[PDB]
Structure 1
């Protein structure tokens, strides 16, 4: 049936000569200009199909959902996962882990705190910590990585860490350094010649080393959980997984074993810590660049929530402006630019082309979030993209920051609740400022690869009264 159009490759080097030195995303966007919304490019010797624009992505991930439900690989972390854990698994193993992960977080019995309550509690701890800074200028990177890591810790380990805990800070350091390395230029070259470059020194080794040190901490927590498990009262995600292992003792095809336990927990930290945190850091940078918008969010908080009680998730339905602002922070932040690689699960017929089973497919989410066919002046921040004439929230088919289809972000619910409660609880309690004039605020990513990493910046949180 034939593959989608694309630059003729050279053996070994593939399409290296037709790439853009800026990175994989620019390379993909440049090729889209020449070959259309659906093309083939060779990363090293591997052929991959690229889908660009809202329409093409929706046709694949939604209209042929099952076919495009396969998961590809990211070379610098594949040595860690190797097909285990809920993110990088395929087939029955993925189906089983996803179903269990959704159900285990979608509800944690009674007597325990809901996910919304754990986030409100973390937002309260955050407010207390920021009050201690007395409004001094700071870089919010560490605290924003802390609050989102703490939500996953609460869910998986059954508790949060104090912001000044040495264990926590070390773990935080390992993770953050890894995300920066993972979307660095080197990791993107590694994506092309891993088969060859895997044999040499480099950042891919430091990434591996850091993630294994985190897996070691995960393993020791699993042992502590095992040693104190009370079947009558599971405490968190690990206890629930351990109880399922007991339930499946006689099932030789169960996927609930050790490797999927450690790597599913790593998956939830990997995914649950990084993107929500960078979205929040990018959102506050935009709020410094658009003080008028920040002021309107604070006015809506005052009208709907007031200044005494904490924001609750059900306030969001009565706060369309703030909700539109968060949508727009996600849309312009474009935190996972070329998506997380998929693969087709069978030879697939797509737009008159044939995509062979297991071929890697990149749904370039950035090209939908910035799709001119759906968003006027896509490169400019405007909450109005999500608001109708009456100020009510409006949907846009191009808005797919969590992707779409069978692989749609498993943590979407948790992430949206974290964005709404952290953004509103911070702005209800603090006004923000920085020495940089709004006009001079640069939104350009410090690094752009599988993740977009926002630039560092200074900000102050002044307690309100």
Structure 2
């Protein structure tokens, strides 16, 4: 068969030279109009299939769920192919270890009420920090990365850190050092400091010192966990990992398992922090721009929850307006616009084309979240996109911010619970304000017109009743 159509490739560098300063997404818009909703682009010598709009993406990821279930391969864009290989973590074992972690993640005890509990507790701690600010203008970027990372910490180590715990501050600094703590100005900051960062003396020394401290912490925590381990009551991720190790007959002193544990915990930290944090940050920017929406949410909190008690996950079912607002925030927020790449597990036939085994495939989630076939005003913030005439929450096929099919976001439940409880506990306790009138606030994704980054903004949290 033939691959889906697309712009003609240059031998060996494919379509890398033919991209626009306009931006990747707008360019994907152009190719789709020119070639349709399934097209092929060449990253160097390697073809990549691009899936646009709700229907094509669901046809692949749901209708042919297994065929499209392959995990992405980022080796693809890796320049060093004058050797090929990949230096893929010390042999067959590390393949073993990564699936050990995946299993542990997939086999790690939901304890939904215990996760809910952890998030309520974090939400309380956040409210006390916000009250202290006494309505001062602030940048909420660091706080929102703090609360989301602290949930991961509580699920991994069994308890949250204090916000100014030295080890917690090193974790947050590592986020900064790895770019998982960026703002609107960050890129001009990096640019200003480029000679420092890239020429001399770089940041590897500072990153090293952070990782050593984090590594020490984790090792000590592992020991303290092992010393009190109870198979009938796994407390957290470390316990579940230890339990699987015990079962595997694994050396308690393995360096491989120790390394593997830390890399898995870093993965969890990174996955669990940035997208959720940025969603909250964007949500409050939208709440500033639409004060009547925010008022309606506060009205619903009052009706269903009241003051007097903290929001609980069970309240969401009774708060369709608030739930719609959060859906809409995620929709317009569009945190992972190109999706996470998949590969097909075998030769795949798709709308009459053939996609060779192990070809990279991007389900462009932005093109579903903005699909006019499913949302009447894709580029306008409107909670009504998720509400019917009776005011009840409406299911929308186009709503796939966590992807779909076999490998939907493993954190989708924790993420949605954080969004619901953080948004409602904050708004129950505070009103918000900024120095910019709503009609003047600009929500366009800053950073070169593309890519990401919500505009950085100032906000006041004004304590209620």
CA distance in 2, matches of 1:96, 1:196: 39
Write out per-residue CA displacement over residues 210-229 of structure 1, whole angstroms, 9 at most, x where no aligned residue: 88986676556445544654
The unaligned stretches of length 5 or more in structure 2 are: none
- Cα distance, 1:292 vs structure 2: 0.5
CA distance in 2, matches of 1:205, 1:48: 37
Q: Secondary structure at the match of 2:328?
A: helix
Q: Secondary structure at the match of 1:447?
A: coil
- Cα distance, 1:103 vs structure 2: 8.6
Q: Secondary structure at the match of 1:29?
A: helix
Q: Secondary structure at the match of 1:198?
A: helix
- Cα distance, 1:261 vs structure 2: 2.9
Contact 1:446 1:453 in 2 (8 A): yes
Contact 2:184 2:455 in 1 (8 A): no
Q: Using a 3 Å threshold, how does the CA distance of structure 1 residues 78 and 9 change in structure 2: closer, same or farther?
A: closer
The unaligned stretches of length 5 or more in structure 1 are: none
- Cα distance, 1:98 vs structure 2: 10
Q: Using a 3 Å threshold, how does the CA distance of structure 1 residues 74 and 222 change in structure 2: closer, same or farther?
A: farther
Q: Using a 3 Å threshold, how does the CA distance of structure 1 residues 372 and 263 change in structure 2: closer, same or farther?
A: same
Contact 1:402 1:412 in 2 (8 A): yes
RMSD across aligned positions (CA): 5.6
Write out per-residue CA displacement over residues 260-284 of structure 1, whole angstroms, 9 at most, x where no aligned residue: 4333322221111111100000000
Write out per-residue CA displacement over residues 317-363 of structure 1, whole angstroms, 9 at most, x where no aligned residue: 00000000000000000001101111111111111111111111111
CA distance in 2, matches of 1:84, 1:305: 58
Q: Using a 3 Å threshold, how does the CA distance of structure 1 residues 69 and 146 change in structure 2: closer, same or farther?
A: same
After TM superposition, the structure 1 stretch with the greater mean CA deviation from structure 2, 266-275 or 214-223, is 214-223
After TM superposition, the structure 1 stretch with the greater mean CA deviation from structure 2, 87-96 or 106-115, is 87-96
CA distance in 2, matches of 1:353, 1:417: 40
After TM superposition, the structure 1 stretch with the greater mean CA deviation from structure 2, 65-74 or 15-24, is 15-24
Other-structure match for 1:192: 192
Write out per-residue CA displacement over residues 180-230 of structure 1, whole angstroms, 9 at most, x where no aligned residue: 599999999999999999999999999999889866765564455446545
- TM-score, normalised to structure 2, is 0.84
Contact 1:108 1:114 in 2 (8 A): no
Q: Using a 3 Å threshold, how does the CA distance of structure 1 residues 40 and 115 change in structure 2: closer, same or farther?
A: same
- Cα distance, 1:288 vs structure 2: 0.3
Contact 1:183 1:451 in 2 (8 A): no
Q: Secondary structure at the match of 2:42?
A: strand
- TM-score, normalised to structure 1, is 0.84
After TM superposition, the structure 1 stretch with the greater mean CA deviation from structure 2, 137-146 or 166-175, is 166-175
Q: Secondary structure at the match of 2:224?
A: helix
After TM superposition, the structure 1 stretch with the greater mean CA deviation from structure 2, 222-231 or 66-75, is 222-231
After TM superposition, the structure 1 stretch with the greater mean CA deviation from structure 2, 400-409 or 170-179, is 170-179
CA distance in 2, matches of 1:204, 1:31: 40
Contact 2:174 2:210 in 1 (8 A): yes
After TM superposition, the structure 1 stretch with the greater mean CA deviation from structure 2, 17-26 or 241-250, is 17-26
Report the count of equivalent residues: 465
